[PDB]
């Protein structure tokens, strides 16, 4: 059952050619293709050495830079597995890893759709508040655990969060006259730890995908765990409205958006940054008459204007969000503090215990 090197074929970009029926490491039998990415691909396998159970296999491209990154991801995943003996912290648990002819492969449990793909297949109709609450709680629980072990994710976004099972019921919305999908179980796992960084490792100047990137990173003031809290704030917003909080493509614009939505950047941050090009007379400087300047002015409103209802549970979500989106990383709510916020008194007994 071993694969000959004749068996192994790669395309122009370094991706493994996989077909239904193929075998890896004399153990995994490919049964479906789950998706692709700039990193490689994700296939569904049966693990014959564990009674034919289902696994998702992440197959990394055979390119040096991808391979090297995968090796650090495995170290992070190993740490997670050793610290979560009882399987309760909701970060995906590696079952195996290997090098298949230069493709690093990592095996995980089979999960459902990512929260972004689900949101898109629902035509960007947002999750109901109770789903936002349960998912928020789980994100805060999982990243609390990662933070307590001297790790920072650095790249949180909706596609990195998967449902355990993404089966849904189809309901109808009187308010907006259309169909809506509602996931039946809102259990989730944080995946991809391909940028997760230890406290003792080198911290690059810029991390995070732009839309989820915090101000300390744009102003090159250094980052640590609070970076993940900012990203969680932007994520919860996007689950609640269904659209991105910061629909931005460059720094100066991104900072204006921050000020329109959140209020003024604090002075002590401005005096400390080397990125003085964004400032004049101690205040953010920009062209209001430009395409970008007109876009922000028409489209970016104070955070509270985005509430869809005015009842207590919505007031509590927005209070938590504001506290996640504090400009000053040192003042931003920690995830241990977030888990004690009144928003989460709203959870069912079942959801709170996992
Ligand atoms: C347009 N397409 C874009 C790609 N889409 C998929 C498909 C399948 C999975 C993930 C995505 O996207 C997100 C993604 O690529 N990552 C977070 C990196 C891979 C993390 N994977 C290895 C985590 C993982 C563990 N168990 C899994 N079970 C199922 N699916 C997984 C699983 N991953 C589909 C839609
Ligand atoms: Cl690949
Ligand atoms: Cl300007």
């Amino acid at each position: 059952s071993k694969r000959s090197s004749r068996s192994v074929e790669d395309d122009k970009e370094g991706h493994l050619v996989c077909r239904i029926g193929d075998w890896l490491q004399e153990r995994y039998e490919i049964v479906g293709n789950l998706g692709e990415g700039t990193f490689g691909k994700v296939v569904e396998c049966l693990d014959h050495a564990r009674g034919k159970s289902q696994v998702a296999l992440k197959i990394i491209r055979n390119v040096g830079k991808y391979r090297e990154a995968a090796r650090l991801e495995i170290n992070v995943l190993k740490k997670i597995k050793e610290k979560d003996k009882e399987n309760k912290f909701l970060c995906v648990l590696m079952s195996d890893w290997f090098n298949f002819h230069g493709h690093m492969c990592i095996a995980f449990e089979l999960l459902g759709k990512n929260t972004f793909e689900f949101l898109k297949e629902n035509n960007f109709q947002p999750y109901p508040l109770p789903h936002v609450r349960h998912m928020a709680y789980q994100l805060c629980h999982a990243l609390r655990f990662l933070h307590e072990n001297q790790l920072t994710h650095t790249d949180l976004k909706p596609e990195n969060i998967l449902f355990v099972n993404s089966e849904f019921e189809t309901l109808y919305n009187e308010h907006k006259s259309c169909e809506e999908k509602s996931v039946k179980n809102t259990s989730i796992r944080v995946a991809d730890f391909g940028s997760a960084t230890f406290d003792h490792e080198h911290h690059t100047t810029i991390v995070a995908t732009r839309h989820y990137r915090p101000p300390e990173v744009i102003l090159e003031l250094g980052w640590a765990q609070p970076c993940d809290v900012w990203s969680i704030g932007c994520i919860l917003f996007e689950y609640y409205r269904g659209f991105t909080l910061f629909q931005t493509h460059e720094n100066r614009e991104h900072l204006v958006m921050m000020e329109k939505i959140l209020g003024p950047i604090p002075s002590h941050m401005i005096h400390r940054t080397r990125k003085q090009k964004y400032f004049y007379k101690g205040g953010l400087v920009w062209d209001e008459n430009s395409s970008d300047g007109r876009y922000v002015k028409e489209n970016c409103k104070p955070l509270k204007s985005y509430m869809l209802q005015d009842s207590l549970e919505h007031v509590q979500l927005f209070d938590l969000m504001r506290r996640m989106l504090e400009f000053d990383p040192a003042q931003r709510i920690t995830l241990a503090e977030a888990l004690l916020h009144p928003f989460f008194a709203g959870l069912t007994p079942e959801e709170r215990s996992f």
Side-chain angles (χ1 to χ4, degrees), residues 1-11 13-174 177-354:
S1 184
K2 157 137 72 150
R3 292 277 292 274
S4 70
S5 54
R6 215 207 298 168
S7 325
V8 175
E9 307 148 343
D10 293 2
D11 63 23
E13 284 79 36
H15 288 257
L16 182 59
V17 187
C18 295
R19 290 169 176 83
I20 310 296
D22 287 0
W23 287 79
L24 308 177
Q25 298 286 104
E26 319 187 67
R27 182 180 173 180
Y28 305 106
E29 179 191 317
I30 297 178
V31 314
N33 192 49
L34 293 171
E36 321 164 36
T38 48
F39 68 84
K41 58 175 81 177
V42 191
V43 307
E44 175 174 336
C45 294
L46 310 180
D47 191 346
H48 286 265
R50 286 285 110 88
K52 290 177 209 162
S53 23
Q54 292 171 292
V55 306
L57 228 62
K58 187 190 196 172
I59 309 180
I60 301 306
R61 289 160 69 187
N62 182 27
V63 165
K65 171 214 301 177
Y66 291 100
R67 177 153 52 258
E68 285 203 51
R71 296 191 194 282
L72 310 189
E73 176 172 19
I74 294 168
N75 198 158
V76 172
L77 283 164
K78 192 200 191 294
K79 168 48 93 175
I80 282 160
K81 185 193 201 329
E82 188 76 294
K83 288 294 197 164
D84 193 7
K85 293 146 172 179
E86 305 178 51
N87 198 342
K88 60 163 303 206
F89 287 115
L90 310 178
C91 297
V92 286
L93 286 169
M94 181 177 65
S95 48
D96 199 21
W97 63 269
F98 54 96
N99 189 332
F100 184 75
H101 293 268
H103 305 282
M104 300 301 299
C105 297
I106 310 197
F108 298 106
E109 304 286 291
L110 188 64
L111 303 174
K113 277 182 195 315
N114 84 64
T115 64
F116 179 77
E117 198 201 337
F118 191 88
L119 171 67
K120 177 170 195 142
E121 302 329 305
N122 194 25
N123 201 36
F124 295 97
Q125 302 303 122
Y127 298 94
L129 191 45
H131 297 181
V132 185
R133 187 158 48 220
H134 187 219
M135 289 168 291
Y137 187 67
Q138 298 171 90
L139 280 187
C140 293
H141 181 73
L143 276 303
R144 201 274 318 154
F145 163 80
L146 196 69
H147 293 173
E148 169 69 57
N149 291 284
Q150 289 69 63
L151 284 154
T152 299
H153 187 282
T154 77
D155 189 31
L156 288 167
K157 49 191 190 191
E159 42 269 79
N160 284 339
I161 301 156
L162 275 62
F163 287 115
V164 173
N165 182 308
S166 44
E167 285 169 21
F168 64 92
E169 286 270 63
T170 300
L171 312 164
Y172 182 88
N173 170 222
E174 294 98 50
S177 314
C178 68
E179 293 188 1
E180 260 191 324
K181 306 173 172 141
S182 184
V183 77
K184 296 189 186 154
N185 192 297
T186 51
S187 295
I188 61 174
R189 295 298 179 273
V190 178
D192 222 49
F193 288 95
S195 299
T197 299
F198 287 102
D199 287 10
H200 70 258
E201 297 175 309
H202 173 77
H203 283 41
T204 53
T205 301
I206 304 306
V207 296
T209 295
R210 198 188 286 285
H211 301 335
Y212 309 101
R213 175 181 308 161
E216 67 274 20
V217 171
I218 298 147
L219 302 166
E220 302 186 22
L221 299 169
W223 56 270
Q225 282 83 7
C227 167
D228 284 341
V229 180
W230 179 276
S231 301
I232 288 160
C234 299
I235 292 161
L236 305 185
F237 181 89
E238 184 168 354
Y239 290 161
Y240 181 83
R241 295 306 307 265
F243 52 87
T244 303
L245 182 45
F246 294 115
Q247 181 75 54
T248 182
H249 73 290
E250 84 82 37
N251 291 331
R252 183 190 308 273
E253 171 192 70
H254 195 176
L255 288 166
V256 175
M257 288 185 166
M258 291 187 187
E259 285 208 340
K260 306 310 221 148
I261 295 176
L262 301 167
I265 297 166
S267 293
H268 82 87
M269 290 177 65
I270 293 176
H271 300 343
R272 291 260 280 192
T273 187
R274 65 177 158 246
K275 314 302 286 177
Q276 287 301 134
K277 78 167 159 205
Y278 303 127
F279 297 100
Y280 188 78
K281 319 246 180 187
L284 201 44
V285 74
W286 55 292
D287 189 359
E288 282 178 41
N289 200 53
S290 68
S291 292
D292 288 350
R294 301 289 174 205
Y295 175 77
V296 179
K297 293 170 68 83
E298 177 60 42
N299 290 283
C300 294
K301 306 283 204 282
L303 181 66
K304 266 171 201 213
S305 71
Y306 296 100
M307 297 182 69
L308 286 161
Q309 277 165 67
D310 45 48
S311 66
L312 181 51
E313 51 179 14
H314 293 256
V315 167
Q316 287 173 328
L317 173 60
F318 275 72
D319 183 274
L320 179 64
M321 272 202 291
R322 204 223 321 112
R323 281 167 167 162
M324 290 179 152
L325 296 176
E326 300 280 321
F327 277 103
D328 186 353
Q331 313 303 310
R332 193 179 297 152
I333 194 151
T334 70
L335 295 184
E337 300 167 334
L339 285 162
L340 300 174
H341 190 276
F343 186 50
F344 297 129
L347 275 164
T348 64
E350 300 91 286
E351 289 171 337
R352 178 170 302 175
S353 312
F354 319 109

